[PDB]
Amino acid sequence: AVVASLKPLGFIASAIADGVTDTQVLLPDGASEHDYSLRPSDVKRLQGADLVVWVGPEMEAFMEKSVRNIPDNKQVTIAQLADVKPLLMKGAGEYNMHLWLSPEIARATAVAIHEKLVELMPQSRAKLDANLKDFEAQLAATDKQVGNELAPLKGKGYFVFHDAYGYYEKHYGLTPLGHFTVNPEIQPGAQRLHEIRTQLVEQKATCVFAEPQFRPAVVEAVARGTSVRMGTLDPLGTNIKLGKTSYSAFLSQLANQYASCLKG
Ligand code: NA
Ligand code: NA
Numbered sequence: 001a002v003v004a005s006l007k008p009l010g011f012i013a014s015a016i017a018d019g020v021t022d023t024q025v026l027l028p029d030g031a032s033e034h035d036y037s038l039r040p041s042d043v044k045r046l047q048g049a050d051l052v053v054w055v056g057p058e059m060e061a062f063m064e065k066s067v068r069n070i071p072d073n074k075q076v077t078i079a080q081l082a083d084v085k086p087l088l089m090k091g092a093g094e095y096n097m098h099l100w101l102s103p104e105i106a107r108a109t110a111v112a113i114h115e116k117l118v119e120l121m122p123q124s125r126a127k128l129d130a131n132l133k134d135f136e137a138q139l140a141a142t143d144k145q146v147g148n149e150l151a152p153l154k155g156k157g158y159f160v161f162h163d164a165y166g167y168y169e170k171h172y173g174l175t176p177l178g179h180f181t182v183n184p185e186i187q188p189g190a191q192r193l194h195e196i197r198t199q200l201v202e203q204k205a206t207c208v209f210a211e212p213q214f215r216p217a218v219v220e221a222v223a224r225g226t227s228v229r230m231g232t233l234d235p236l237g238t239n240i241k242l243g244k245t246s247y248s249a250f251l252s253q254l255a256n257q258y259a260s261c262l263k264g
Contacts, residue, residue: 002113003045005054005063006033007236008100009078009109011246013053015135016113018244020124021050026063029238030213036062046070051116053109055079059097073119076112083108089166101235101254102167103143106247110135134244142248146255147172156262158207159200159228161214164235168254177203180222184214187221200226207231207261212238231261 001022004010010025017023026042027033038046043066046052056079057064067075078084078099087105089096099105114132118125150172163179180196182188188196200208200223209231210219223230234257237250 001045001049002051002053002117003049004052005060006100007238007240007242008247008250009053009055010242011237011240011250012100012106012109012135013051013113014242015138015244015247016110016117016128016131018131020117020121020127020131023242024049025242027060029236032062033059033236034061036060038062038066042066049074050120051076051113053078053113055097055099058095059099073116076109076116078105078109078112081108081112083111089170091166096164096166098164098167098235101165103139103171103251105167107136107139110139131244135247138245138248142251146251149255149259150174153259153262156206156264157204158209158231158262159203159205160209160233162211162235165233168251172255174258177205180208182210182214182218182222184211184218187218193221196222197224197226200228206264209233209258209261211235229261231257233257 001024002013002017003024004013006027007025010023014023024045027036046066052067052070052075054060054063054077056077058079079097084105087102110132114128117128154173155175157175157177159177160179161182169176205228207229208223212232212234219230237253240246240250
């Protein structure tokens with residue numbers, strides 16, 4: 001099986017491995033993309049894998065140690081790929097490691113998976129070549145479709161709670177105004193909330209975007225009194241099944257999520 005750290009990396013793997021081997025995802029829905037605790041049985045799955053796919057030690061810190069014992073012909077470390085380096089985005093002294101939100105990095109990931117699976121399973125070269133073909137065709141078609149869906153929303157300002165979507169935003173020309181540090185469970189105290197609400201109004205935000213783990217109460221406490229619309233973005237596509245068309249569905253779903261709140 002191909003074992004991916006995170007569900008959207010599973011989407012990409014499952015396109016290339018389709019009908020060749022299963023793909024499995026380690027990280028549960030709602031668990032920490034950084035600090036999940038791998039169980040002994042996750043380690044075994046990693047070591048048993050035909051191929052391990054992950055972003056790298058600056059994202060899934062939780063698997064760094066476990067993947068040391070695994071040869072390089074059996075792992076794709078996306079942040080270390082030659083074709084990814086120039087696409088890695090540094091800002092305010094930090095690199096964005098949410099690489100599965102970049103269509104171009106997703107394409108280099110698919111290419112790297114394809115290349116490793118072909119060396120490992122030459123008896124399936126043709127199916128794997130066909131799978132990479134279908135993945136790229138669907139990615140091109142989705143890119144253009146999403147591009148057109150989000151083109152008319154340039155200039156609609158918004159804030160997010162998790163500044164994780166920059167690859168997708170910079171690629172499709174979206175206009176985020178900035179981000180608020182907000183606990184998903186506990187709303188901010190009156191002072192900082194006051195500041196947030198006035199920024200929402202001052203900078204003329206159309207929307208504020210939370211993620212599925214935020215309690216609605218906390219999101220409402222933020223948007224209350226402003227007339228800024230509330231949105232939800234799922235950067236992990238927890239509602240999408242693995243499968244050949246899944247990465248494209250993921251990109252399109254995310255487009256819909258944005259468009260839905262920003263549309264006017
Ligand atoms: Na390079
Ligand atoms: Na983060």
